[PDB]
Design a protein around this ligand. Structure first.
Ligand SMILES: [Zn+2]
Ligand SMILES: [Zn+2]
Ligand SMILES: [Zn+2]
Lengths: 99, 55, 56, 56, 56, 88, 98, 119, 237, 47, 65
């Protein structure tokens, strides 16, 4: 459900109200990341999210014409847009995530 | 029922008939508007005995 | 249930458990058992609320 | 014991045969509806009574 | 005290009656409920006496 | 290859299902009995009737032998049982 | 239950084009007084049309769903009494395999 | 009750007396159209209706997987195979008659024995 | 797919069993009174009456539907033209409108874009809508005559389940519309960049954090209990 | 009663009768009691 | 986590024989009953105490730290 949402329904929501009288064509979902004060953004993993209370979200970038960061979508775990999806057992275990 | 007649059944069924509410909606198959123009002759070819017995 | 053809008024189709808890329930019987069971449970869950209000 | 289970199955089967006969009579509508009850509810009351009697 | 248009004073009187009303009772029939700054209904004295959670 | 098909509640309306993958298509007194197959027109069959049960209810040994309210109380209490919730 | 899943949802447009191409006439041309019997074909609840051979149509749709041309998500129900053939592709529908 | 619409106006036809002919003429008053009543009936209600119980019969009803088969003898072709169903109409009062569609001839016959019905 | 528009439409058979005045009517969005069905068909375009009764009762031999429809066509004769029917939806619209302007257009919009949006939003054709209203009336009539199942509200074929996909879809729809309004207001203020991304971020974060599934915190009708803390007491839980 | 099929033929005594005739039939059907007492839906004889 | 040190019921030491049980199961390819009996558990309390163990220590151990 979340996968089909992030793949198709997000694009559909953007495209229904692209136009305005400034038009939005395409939306990119990046991998989860953290924008930390007085620092540089880095990849954020679920274990670090839980341990530092960080919301586990990824920025949504939309192109605009006459890329802007419209916001952050929290990512359901083991979805198609997380680090643990393309993870084997030892990958999870190195990442401190139980299979 | 009445004391001296409680053991009876004729009175019991009689009073069942006398108290049981009866409405035409239960008993009529079909109450319908028909056209019969004349009194002496009826359009329905089978109905005639109704007016023969009247006559 | 989907497993009985329509117009099936037999006891097996209409909730009659044929056999005991020692002996076990066929899955239709177990589902009808569950339906009766949560009928009972919901009935107590509402009767307690009613009876509490009446008592008060 | 085995004889008791055998005879229990016999009573349940007899009740089922009785319910089937009642059903067939209803399907051929030779059954008069009970006073104060329609034919559907009459058939259902007969069936539930016979199943309860069998279980008892 | 200042100029009295008699319609803006009517509006302010309506507002102050509404405010006293929601202050003393938040269950008016066919009128919007007073909302607090946070958007939830504001807790009136009727409400503080009203229900099971109420005072009585 | 069309060996398994998905049926929802609405499509369940117009299909006759077989219970046992082999028994209804074509006795020891304590052995399991079944309503005879007077229908030769089955369209689907259960993979296994046990799968009607959910996650908490399928932990139970012999739910059919249980009473159904006890199966419900177990399904509530197993969530509260103590164990290893995760290996991390 | 254990073997129970929810439809993500699919676009019905392939099913409408197929229904058009396989003989489901449009709804404008439906003329009930000439046509006393004809299945009403619905897709996602929209009465898209009518069809004069529900058996052949339903067999075709079934075979396509098994072979995988049509998504196994979509559910198709032929009600012979009401003479309807309803197709549902929308999300949120609960289904189990068999 | 039979009912018919005014020609090339397509609107229902009210009844009106013709005492001069002492006859029933359906007249459309939207357009000055009049026609003799085909049947004396002008209305129908059927407080109990004997129709619709067999509604849903089609040519391929016998091939419905969902119905229950039966082994009853068809009166005409003496074919054993049928599909049987209850009255499609429902009432608390309606009896539990079974209607048998013969797959061979698609003919409806009843489980009752006192009264024979062709449909 | 979008706009989250639940155009509820009711169709009621006013009267009671054994009453003579058995009048079928129907509701429209933003209309205050149940328009008679014959007037709705007039508005949609079926000026003729036999066409209406054919769109309702498919089997002409089955007189019972026409018999129960007789009061409807009797009392709906007060309109006999499409423009008049749209205009009657206009008189009940009551949007300070004139016989031609702002009122027939309101009725046209109501009967086109708001009456059964799922059938078709397009301008081209409205015979679909008439046929579907006829089907719906037929189903109501059959239930009135006890010839068909009254739908059980508890049947899973008729129920659906919004999972994480549809629910987040709803939230993102409202949050994005709020963002579009904000940027539009900013562009207007630019009479002679600058997008509040926290509008989409923090709102969605709240809606997941508290379970209040609402477009904004201010709405108390958010239907709480959507998102809950994952109960990791045990694996089965 | 001896006739295999029994009917009632009812007539209005001596214009515009057809319009109110349906209301007359309506009242003469529901609001007419042949025997009994009003509200007495069903009555059963037990021992 | 690890095999219990002692049988809960009788108190027989069963932590001695976990790896012997695994070896008899894997190397010798003996069924569960034969492996337990050859390990010398006669009481079904001890027998379930070894038979029902889950070696969760392995899963917990072979994380990083
Ligand atoms: Zn005309
Ligand atoms: Zn035959
Ligand atoms: Zn021990």
């Amino acid at each position: 459900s979340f996968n089909q949402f992030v793949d198709y329904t997000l694009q559909d929501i953007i495209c229904e109200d692209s136009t305005l009288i400034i038009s939005f064509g395409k939306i990119y979902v990046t991998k989860p990341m953290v924008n930390e004060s007085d620092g540089v953004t880095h990849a954020l993993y679920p274990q670090e999210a839980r341990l530092r209370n960080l919301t586990y979200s990824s920025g949504l970038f939309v192109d605009v014409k006459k890329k802007v960061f419209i916001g952050r979508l929290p990512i359901m775990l083991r979805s198609k847009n997380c680090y643990l999806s393309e993870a084997t057992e030892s990958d999870l275990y190195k990442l401190k995530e139980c299979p | 029922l009445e004391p001296g007649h409680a053991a009876d059944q004729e009175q019991a069924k009689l009073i069942r008939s006398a108290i049981e509410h009866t409405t035409l909606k239960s008993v009529t198959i079909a109450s319908e508007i028909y056209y019969d123009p004349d009194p002496r002759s009826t359009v329905i070819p089978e109905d005639e005995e109704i007016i023969q017995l009247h006559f | 249930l989907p497993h009985f053809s329509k117009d099936d008024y037999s006891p097996e189709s209409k909730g009659f458990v044929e056999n005991s808890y020692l002996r076990g329930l066929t899955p239709q019987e177990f589902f009808f058992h569950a339906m009766g069971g949560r009928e009972g449970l919901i009935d107590t869950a509402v009767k307690t609320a009613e009876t509490g209000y009446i008592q008060r | 014991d085995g004889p008791t289970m055998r005879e229990i199955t016999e009573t349940i089967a007899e009740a089922k045969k009785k319910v089937l006969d009642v059903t067939k009579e209803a399907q051929a509508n030779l059954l008069t509806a009970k006073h104060g009850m329609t034919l559907r509810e009459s058939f259902e009351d007969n069936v539930v009574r016979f199943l309860n009697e069998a279980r008892d | 005290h200042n100029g009295a248009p008699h319609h803006a004073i009517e509006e302010a009187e309506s507002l102050l009656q509404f405010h006293v009303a929601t202050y003393m009772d938040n269950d008016i029939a066919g009128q919007p409920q007073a909302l607090q700054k946070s958007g939830r209904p504001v807790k009136s004295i009727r409400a503080r006496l009203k229900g099971k959670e109420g005072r009585i | 290859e069309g060996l398994v098909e998905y049926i929802d509640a609405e499509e369940e309306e117009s299909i006759l299902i077989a219970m046992q993958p082999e028994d209804l298509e074509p006795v020891d007194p304590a052995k399991r009995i079944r309503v005879s197959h007077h229908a030769t027109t089955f369209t689907h069959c259960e993979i296994h009737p046990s799968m009607i049960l959910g996650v908490a209810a399928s932990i139970i040994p012999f739910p059919d032998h249980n009473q159904s309210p006890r199966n419900t109380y177990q399904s509530a209490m197993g969530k509260q049982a103590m164990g290893v919730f995760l290996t991390n | 239950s254990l073997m129970s899943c929810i439809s993500v949802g699919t676009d019905p447009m392939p099913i409408i084009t197929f229904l058009s191409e396989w003989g489901m006439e449009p709804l404008e041309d439906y003329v009930p007084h000439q046509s006393p019997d004809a299945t009403r074909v619905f897709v996602n609840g929209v009465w898209h049309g009518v069809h004069r051979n529900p058996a052949r149509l339903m067999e075709t749709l079934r075979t396509l769903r098994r072979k995988g041309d049509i998504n196994p998500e979509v559910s198709m129900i032929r009600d012979i009494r009401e003479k309807e053939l309803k197709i549902f592709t929308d999300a949120g529908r609960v289904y189990r395999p068999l | 009750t039979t009912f018919r619409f005014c020609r090339d106006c397509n609107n229902m036809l009210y009844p009106r007396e013709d005492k001069e002919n002492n006859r029933l003429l359906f007249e459309c008053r939207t357009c000055s159209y009049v026609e003799e009543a085909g049947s004396p009936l002008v209305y129908r209600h059927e407080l109990i209706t004997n129709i619709g119980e067999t509604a849903g019969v089609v040519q391929d009803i016998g091939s419905d997987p969902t119905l229950p088969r039966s082994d009853r003898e068809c009166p005409k072709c003496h074919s054993r195979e049928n599909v049987f169903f209850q009255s499609q109409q429902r009432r608390k009062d309606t009896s539990m008659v079974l209607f048998f569609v013969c797959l061979s001839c698609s003919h409806i016959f009843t489980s009752d024995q006192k009264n024979k019905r062709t449909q | 797919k979008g706009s989250r528009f639940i155009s509820t439409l009711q169709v009621k058979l006013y009267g009671r069993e054994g009453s003579s005045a058995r009048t079928i009517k129907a509701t429209l969005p933003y209309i205050k009174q149940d328009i008679p069905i014959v007037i709705i068909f007039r508005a949609l375009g079926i000026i003729p009456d036999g066409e209406i009764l054919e769109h309702i009762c498919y089997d002409v031999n089955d007189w019972q539907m026409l018999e129960m429809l007789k009061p409807c066509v009797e009392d709906g004769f007060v309109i006999q033209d499409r423009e008049t029917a749209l205009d009657f939806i206009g008189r009940r619209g009551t949007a300070l409108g004139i016989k031609k302007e702002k009122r027939i257009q309101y009725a046209k919009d109501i009967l086109q874009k708001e009456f059964l949006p799922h059938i078709t939003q397009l301008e081209g054709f409205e015979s679909r809508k008439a046929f579907f209203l006829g089907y719906m009336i037929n189903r109501l009539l059959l239930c009135a005559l006890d010839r068909k199942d009254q739908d059980d509200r508890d049947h899973f074929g008729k129920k659906r389940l919004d999972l994480a996909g549809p629910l987040l879809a709803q939230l993102f729809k409202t949050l994005f519309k709020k963002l579009t309004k904000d940027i539009f207001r900013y562009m207007q203020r630019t009479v002679e960049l600058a997008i509040n991304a926290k509008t989409i971020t923090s709102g969605l974060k709240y809606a997941l954090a508290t379970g209040n599934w609402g477009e904004q915190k201010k709405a108390m009708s958010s239907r709480a209990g959507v998102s809950q803390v994952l109960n990791r007491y045990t694996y089965s839980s | 009663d001896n006739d295999e099929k029994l009917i009632i033929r009812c007539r209005v005594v001596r214009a515009e009768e057809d319009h109110m005739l349906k209301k007359i039939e309506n009242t003469m059907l529901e609001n007419i009691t042949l025997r009994g007492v009003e509200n007495i839906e069903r009555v059963v004889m037990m021992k | 986590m690890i095999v219990p040190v002692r049988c809960f019921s009788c108190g027989k030491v069963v932590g001695d024989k976990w790896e012997s049980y695994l070896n008899l199961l894997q190397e010798d390819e003996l069924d569960e009953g034969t492996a337990l009996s050859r390990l010398g558990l006669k009481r079904y309390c001890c027998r379930r105490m070894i038979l029902t163990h889950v070696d969760l220590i392995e899963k917990f151990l072979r994380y990083n730290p």
